[PDB]
Amino acid sequence: NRRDLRDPDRTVIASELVEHSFGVTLDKHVYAALKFTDEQRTLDIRDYTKQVLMP
C-alpha cells in the first residue's frame, strides 16, 4: 500500500498473506498377468524371457 508523506493520519494498513494447497493421490493399480501350465512351460516356452517377460 502507498500513503502520503507528512500526513497527519499515521495509520498503516496491514497486509494479508494466504497460502494454498492441493493434493496428489495414488489411486490406480497397473498390472499385466499370465498363467502357464507346467506342460506348456516345459514344452511350449522356449526362451522364457523373450517370449513372456518382454511382452
Question: Position of cell 511382452?
Answer: 55
Question: CB-wise, 41 or 51, nearer to a copy of itself?
Answer: 51
Q: Does 14 bind a copy of itself (CB under 8 A)?
A: yes
State the minimum distance, in angstroms, from the CB of residue 22 to a copy of itself. 18
Number of residues that bind a copy of itself (CB under 8 A): 24
Q: Does 2 bind a copy of itself (CB under 8 A)?
A: yes
Backbone CA torsion sign across 40, 43, 47, 48: positive
Locate 1 and state its grid cell.
Answer: 500500500
